[PDB]
Structure formats: C-alpha cells, structure tokens
Amino acid sequence: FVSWQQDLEDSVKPTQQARPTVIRWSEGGKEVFISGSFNNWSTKIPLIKSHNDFVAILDLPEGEHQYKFFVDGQWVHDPSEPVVTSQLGTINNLIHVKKSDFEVFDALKLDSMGQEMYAFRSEESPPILPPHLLQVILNKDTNISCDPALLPEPNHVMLNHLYALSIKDSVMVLSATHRYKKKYVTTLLYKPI
C-alpha cells in the first residue's frame, strides 16, 4: 500500500501547467482599467476588485511589455513599480517576464541582494552553553549483555564536537563522533604531548 503511494508521487515529473502574470494596483477608485502592448492598446481590460487591492490575471507571452492604468477616467501609471518612457510621451509601467519557475526564479531572486582565507585580529557577552553537550555518550554505561564496542544512538547536535579527558600522564586523550553514510562512529585518539 505504502509503496503504491510513494510510486504515484514518483511518476509525476516536475513542470508548470500555466504561465500567467499578476498585474495588480491598490487604490480607492471604483472603476479601474488597464491597457498595454499585448492587446495593442485597442481594448481596456477590467480589474477585479479585492476590497482594498485590485488585480486582473492575463496570460502574457515572455518579453518586454509596457502597460498603463486608468482610474475614474484618468490614465495614471503606478509609481512603486519600474516604468519606461514611450514614443507618444507618457512613461508607462514596464512588465518584463522571462522565467516563471519556482526553483530557478528563487535563485535569480536569490542572487539579488567576512573575508575568504584572511587571518586578522578583531577589536570590539558570550552565549550560554547548551546542556545537551554536557552529557557524553562515552561517559554513559551500556548493558553487560551487549557488545562492548557497541554504543547507543547519539544526538545529532553532539557529533562533530570535540570531547577530551584530562591527561593523567604525558599522553593526551581526545575523541569526537562523526557520521558517515547515515552511520555514526565515535573515534578515540591516544597521542603523547
């Protein structure tokens, strides 16, 4: 049963069915309309009204398209979004669509917006130690029946943190837990000073 459910998700191949564009404007005007280059400025597309916001969805093809809003019989563009100057005179708001895929788009969005291998002293309270590190897996005692080389499952945070025992003699003892291939290994080191 479970395999079948997992299989169904697997069968699907990532893609986007439709590629639309938002085109929204916030105002207090009752009648709102928008005309651009997609319809060759022949017809005025009506804006549906959110109680505050106004928005109208239109499947526009990829490329640079200049649009202008008309509120209460007055053709006024949106200041907040980028605009480009037209050959007629008025500077209409420009909408440029190239990619509408979430993973790629984020990266492009991601791209927008201290020193590599540079050792230097810094000038001008430390954070409180978590108690999850204080408990050591090597200090914990296991059952007499089970294998001595076997250890219990460690907390994810603990591994990669160095744990050292005070040196009775010249020899130094230090160990750390590491994860390989979803496997956990606690390696101990004996080395004299």
């Binding site: 080389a149 076997l150 250890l151 003699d169 496997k183 606690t186 390696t187 101990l188 004996y190």
Partner: peptide, 30 residues
C-alpha cells in the same frame, strides 16, 4: 555489517606499548 553507533580507539605510534594495552582494558575494545 558496520553498526549504527560504534566505539573505535586509535593509538599514535609515538606512545609507550605498556600504556596502550592498559588503554584497551579501560575502553573495553579487543
């Protein structure tokens, strides 16, 4: 064959052989 969580001991060739056998006892590894 490798268990989910295990204990492994490593000795540096520079330390005394007498201290190494006494270390295997305290850690319980063969």
């Amino acid at each position: 064959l490798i268990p989910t969580s295990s204990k492994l001991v490593v000795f540096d060739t520079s330390l005394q052989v007498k201290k190494a056998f006494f270390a295997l006892v305290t850690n319980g590894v063969r």
